[PDB]
Amino acid sequence: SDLELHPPSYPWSHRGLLSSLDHTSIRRGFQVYKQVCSSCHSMDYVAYRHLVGVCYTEDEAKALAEEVEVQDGPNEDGEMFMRPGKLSDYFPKPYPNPEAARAANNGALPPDLSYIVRARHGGEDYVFSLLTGYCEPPTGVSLREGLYFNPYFPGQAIGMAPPIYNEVLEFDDGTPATMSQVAKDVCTFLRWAAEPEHDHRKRMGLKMLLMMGLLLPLVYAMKRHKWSVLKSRKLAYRPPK
Amino acid sequence: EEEELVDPLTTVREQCEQLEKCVKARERLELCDERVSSRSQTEEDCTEELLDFLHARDHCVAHKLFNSLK
Amino acid sequence: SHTDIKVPDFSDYRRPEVLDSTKSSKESSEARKGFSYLVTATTTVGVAY
Amino acid sequence: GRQFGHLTRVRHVITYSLSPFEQRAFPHYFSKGIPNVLRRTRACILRVAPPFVAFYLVYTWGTQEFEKSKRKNPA
Amino acid sequence: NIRKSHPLMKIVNNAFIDLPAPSNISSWWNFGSLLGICLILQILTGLFLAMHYTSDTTTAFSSVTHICRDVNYGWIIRYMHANGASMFFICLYMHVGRGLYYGSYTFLETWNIGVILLLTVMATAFMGYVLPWGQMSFWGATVITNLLSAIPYIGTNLVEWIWGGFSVDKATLTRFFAFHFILPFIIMAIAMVHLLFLHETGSNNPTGISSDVDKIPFHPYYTIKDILGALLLILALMLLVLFAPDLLGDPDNYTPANPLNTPPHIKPEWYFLFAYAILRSIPNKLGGVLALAFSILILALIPLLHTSKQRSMMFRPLSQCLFWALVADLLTLTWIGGQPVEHPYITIGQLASVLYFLLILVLMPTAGTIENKLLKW
Amino acid sequence: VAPTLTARLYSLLFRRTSTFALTIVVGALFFERAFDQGADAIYEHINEGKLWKHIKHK
Numbered sequence: 001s002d003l004e005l006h007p008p009s010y011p012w013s014h015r016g017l018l019s020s021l022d023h024t025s026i027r028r029g030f031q032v033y034k035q036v037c038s039s040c041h042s043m044d045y046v047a048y049r050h051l052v053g054v055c056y057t058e059d060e061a062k063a064l065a066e067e068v069e070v071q072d073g074p075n076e077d078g079e080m081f082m083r084p085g086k087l088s089d090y091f092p093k094p095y096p097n098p099e100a101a102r103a104a105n106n107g108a109l110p111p112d113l114s115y116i117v118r119a120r121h122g123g124e125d126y127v128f129s130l131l132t133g134y135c136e137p138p139t140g141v142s143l144r145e146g147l148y149f150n151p152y153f154p155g156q157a158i159g160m161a162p163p164i165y166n167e168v169l170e171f172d173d174g175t176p177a178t179m180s181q182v183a184k185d186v187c188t189f190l191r192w193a194a195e196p197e198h199d200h201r202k203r204m205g206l207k208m209l210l211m212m213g214l215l216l217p218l219v220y221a222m223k224r225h226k227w228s229v230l231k232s233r234k235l236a237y238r239p240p241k
Numbered sequence: 242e243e244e245e246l247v248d249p250l251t252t253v254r255e256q257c258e259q260l261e262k263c264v265k266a267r268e269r270l271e272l273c274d275e276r277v278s279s280r281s282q283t284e285e286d287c288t289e290e291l292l293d294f295l296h297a298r299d300h301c302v303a304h305k306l307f308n309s310l311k
Numbered sequence: 312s313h314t315d316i317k318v319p320d321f322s323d324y325r326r327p328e329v330l331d332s333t334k335s336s337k338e339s340s341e342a343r344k345g346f347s348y349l350v351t352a353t354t355t356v357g358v359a360y
Numbered sequence: 361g362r363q364f365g366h367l368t369r370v371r372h373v374i375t376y377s378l379s380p381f382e383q384r385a386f387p388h389y390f391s392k393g394i395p396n397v398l399r400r401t402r403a404c405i406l407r408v409a410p411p412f413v414a415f416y417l418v419y420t421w422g423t424q425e426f427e428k429s430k431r432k433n434p435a
Numbered sequence: 436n437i438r439k440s441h442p443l444m445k446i447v448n449n450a451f452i453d454l455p456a457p458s459n460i461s462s463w464w465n466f467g468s469l470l471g472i473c474l475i476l477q478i479l480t481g482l483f484l485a486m487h488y489t490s491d492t493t494t495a496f497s498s499v500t501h502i503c504r505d506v507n508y509g510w511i512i513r514y515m516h517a518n519g520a521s522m523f524f525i526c527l528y529m530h531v532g533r534g535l536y537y538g539s540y541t542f543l544e545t546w547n548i549g550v551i552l553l554l555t556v557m558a559t560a561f562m563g564y565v566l567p568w569g570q571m572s573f574w575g576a577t578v579i580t581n582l583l584s585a586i587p588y589i590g591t592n593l594v595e596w597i598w599g600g601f602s603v604d605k606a607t608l609t610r611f612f613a614f615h616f617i618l619p620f621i622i623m624a625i626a627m628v629h630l631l632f633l634h635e636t637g638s639n640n641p642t643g644i645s646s647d648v649d650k651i652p653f654h655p656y657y658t659i660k661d662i663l664g665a666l667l668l669i670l671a672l673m674l675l676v677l678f679a680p681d682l683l684g685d686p687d688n689y690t691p692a693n694p695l696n697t698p699p700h701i702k703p704e705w706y707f708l709f710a711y712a713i714l715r716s717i718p719n720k721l722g723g724v725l726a727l728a729f730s731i732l733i734l735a736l737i738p739l740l741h742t743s744k745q746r747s748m749m750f751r752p753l754s755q756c757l758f759w760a761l762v763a764d765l766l767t768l769t770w771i772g773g774q775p776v777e778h779p780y781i782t783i784g785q786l787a788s789v790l791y792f793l794l795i796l797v798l799m800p801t802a803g804t805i806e807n808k809l810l811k812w
Numbered sequence: 813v814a815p816t817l818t819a820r821l822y823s824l825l826f827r828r829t830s831t832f833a834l835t836i837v838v839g840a841l842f843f844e845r846a847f848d849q850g851a852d853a854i855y856e857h858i859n860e861g862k863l864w865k866h867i868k869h870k
């Protein structure tokens with residue numbers, strides 16, 4: 001039905017002009033991605049070395065890559081083989097073609113997570129709102145199990161589930177991971193998978209504001225200086241008597 | 242799950258959900274909710290009332306939330 | 312009669328360093344060109360960046 | 361085309377100028393300046409402003425009716 | 436000496452150095468260089484983009500991501516292109532407007548070439564947006580291109596001719612790429628001719644009076660003021676691309692193309708929204724595209740409906756109000772154009788469309804006549 | 813300060829277009845070093861993802 005609700009405005013650490021992006025959070029959010037989110041969501045536009053300078057250290061990132069496997073190049077016959085992932089291959093399609101998603105997932109197709117924060121309005125807020133907030137299907141509404149109920153999601157008939165159910169945890173520094181903290185982190189990491197350039201963008205922006213803020217007055221004084229012969233200028237008309 | 246992770250959302254939501262604007266909204270929810278139940282061949286489905294409540298609740302949630310989160 | 316040809320007062324526009332009919336202008340010239348040029352030099356350094 | 365010296369015919373008009381290195385680029389900037397911007401605004405509001413508010417109003421009204429329409433009580 | 440005589444320098448000298456210009460032009464005359472600037476900025480970031488982009492359906496979108504993540508500084512280059520397109524449109528809209536307000540259109544050739552320049556960049560930009568092969572790229576490519584099917588007895592064949600297939604498929608992307616590359620160079624030659632006809636009279640000015648009596652050389656004066664002018668263009672552009680890269684594109688066009696989906700959305704980029712509104716205001720296939728076209732080619736009718744004895748609007752109050760109602764009406768049009776065709780929006784979108792045409796075709800010329808009469812002219 | 817800084821800037825460094833060009837280019841170097849770092853530094857009032865701060869922990 002064409003009747004719905006729009007997400008509120010959460011105070012992320014990466015909204016409001018010159019603003020980093022919580023990197024310790026991107027990392028916890030990566031954890032959330034690899035453990036709970038990746039099972040049914042592809043992020044095929046992000047590789048392991050992207051996680052380098054950012055959250056993890058070089059060795060750390062390779063170790064994660066190493067872990068599981070992919071279908072590497074042709075064995076000298078004509079069949080491919082398996083090996084421990086390198087730092088250069090992108091995260092890991094759980095479903096081959098599109099219809100495999102339909103098969104293993106009620107008949108629905110779970111959309112890619114490479115962008116998503118830029119592919120849905122409100123961005124991280126919508127994902128945050130889609131995550132944490134889940135509700136009891138009101139009166140006269142007929143779910144049908146495949147579709148769950150979800151405020152925010154258009155139509156209210158979803159197909160996902162709330163895979164945030166307070167846990168299926170992880171941890172480095174051991175953050176008390178409830179559904180809240182586990183959600184914020186995914187979105188924060190999601191921001192980064194959508195817009196990696198985020199930090200630097202805003203850094204150049206700081207420099208751009210400081211420079212423009214210094215060039216603008218100077219170019220103006222250059223201009224009024226030359227125009228001053230004209231702005232200050234006097235006319236007189238002296239016709240023959 | 243059964244008892245022992247202090248979901249901050251739930252905590253802040255309580256205080257939030259409570260509040261005036263949402264009290265009134267939930268009142269209408271219940272009002273309309275009880276109508277829908279009180280019949281058979283009806284269709285005024287109570288979907289709108291829920292969102293209004295949620296909206297009012299959720300704005301106040303955003304404002305008070307993340308403060309605590311680590 | 313072209314001798315009636317005034318030259319409107321510009322005190323209302325002249326920099327301070329040049330406000331006195333009583334004294335030279337060769338002195339404040341360096342400071343004046345200095346300022347105006349420093350402005351354009353600083354600008355090019357800026358744009359250069 | 362057009363050049364300088366072939367533009368038009370002008371007679372008896374004197375023009376005094378002063379070198380840019382002898383005057384200020386920002387004379388009464390705030391003093392004379394601001395009153396001028398106020399005067400220019402006065403002169404133009406009644407011709408610029410109204411059309412816009414007509415839209416401003418059409419805009420907020422237009423949205424309210426839309427949003428309020430996707431709701432309903434009986435029938 | 437050297438500047439004046441040398442075959443190449445003459446050109447430069449006659450266009451940017453000794454060109455007699457009115458000592459009178461205001462900020463609204465800066466959009467001329469600004470478009471010039473936008474044109475180059477859009478060719479320069481455009482070329483660097485073509486060094487990594489591939490025009491094939493299966494890699495199209497992927498290559499654009501490749502640019503933003505892997506290509507060094509690919510992201511700025513990408514967003515500068517994206518935002519420069521809108522910046523090019525704001526400037527284009529200021530420029531046309533400026534001329535309308537000031538009677539600059541009395542220079543038919545210059546103006547008419549200007550209309551050809553308006554169309555050329557519109558056709559250019561429309562093809563640009565399809566290249567990433569996003570949801571909106573495909574459906575906007577579909578919705579808009581399909582209009583030509585309203586042309587009687589020729590239309591079906593036409594749409595199928597430019598499409599390359601029976602849809603917006605493989606042939607269409609590569610096709611649209613080629614034209615998106617070739618178009619801005621043609622635009623350039625045309626801007627030279629734009630400037631060629633303009634130089635034949637020199638610029639107009641806010642009074643619409645005539646400035647032979649007070650011209651100043653284009654050099655210190657307008658080179659330095661265009662510089663300061665380009666600087667502000669950069670600010671607007673950079674403020675847009677660094678702080679809000681997806682603001683005017685709206686968070687949407689990500690997620691690849693899907694010829695079976697059809698998003699409950701469908702609207703061209705903001706610069707076509709006024710035209711878009713006019714089109715859907717009319718219940719009729721033919722009429723819609725007829726009025727769609729007319730909403731822009733009408734610029735070629737403006738000089739025939741001048742009517743006033745004065746050239747500019749500076750001394751004409753009633754005309755000013757009517758002009759402002761035109762701009763105000765054009766906001767409504769884009770605003771409506773950016774909304775679904777439901778209850779309130781249809782009827783005002785309908786009314787505003789009639790007004791657009793009533794204003795330019797009837798109200799404005801009448802005000803001119805009235806104005807003449809009040810002055811006893 | 814005294815017979816003017818600008819006066820000396822003009823007399824010793826701005827009267828020729830050579831020295832003028834020369835100072836601008838020398839002034840371009842340092843400015844870059846000072847600002848590029850200055851702006852990177854000011855940016856450090858966000859002791860957050862600060863790669864340096866994380867470098868110590870892991």
Ligand code: HEM
Pocket residue numbers: 036037038039040041105108109110111116120127130131153157158159160161163186
């Ligand atoms: C691993 C278990 C998961 C499964 C089986 C799953 C499945 C799905 C499905 C079927 C949909 C489509 C809903 C519909 O079309 O009605 C969906 C959408 C979505 N998924 Fe999941 N999902 C999972 C986990 C996640 C997680 C953990 C996240 C992010 C934290 C996520 C992010 C999203 C988002 C943001 C949408 C919204 C699509 C839209 O708004 O149109 N998914 N998922």
Ligand code: HEM
Pocket residue numbers: 474477478479480481482484485488499513514516517519520521523556559560562563564565566567615616617618619620
């Ligand atoms: C001949 C010079 C040009 C070249 C070589 C060029 C190249 C490209 C390429 C390779 C793309 C696809 C990559 C991308 O989407 O970022 C693109 C997209 C686009 N072009 Fe151009 N372009 C040129 C001129 C122009 C002109 C003059 C305009 C009009 C303002 C324009 C408007 C656009 C737009 C709106 C997009 C899509 C926006 C985006 O997704 O970033 N281009 N162009």
Ligand code: HEM
Pocket residue numbers: 463464465466467468470471474527530531534537539540542545546547548549550552553556622626629630633637638639640734
């Ligand atoms: C590629 C896009 C365009 C470029 C590069 C361009 C360039 C220019 C330039 C450089 C000027 C110098 C005067 C000034 O600074 O305003 C000018 C003036 C003018 N342009 Fe354009 N223009 C473009 C599009 C247009 C279009 C869309 C129109 C209107 C249909 C137009 C019509 C005119 C007219 C009538 C003048 C005379 C203005 C006056 O003397 O007051 N141009 N144009």
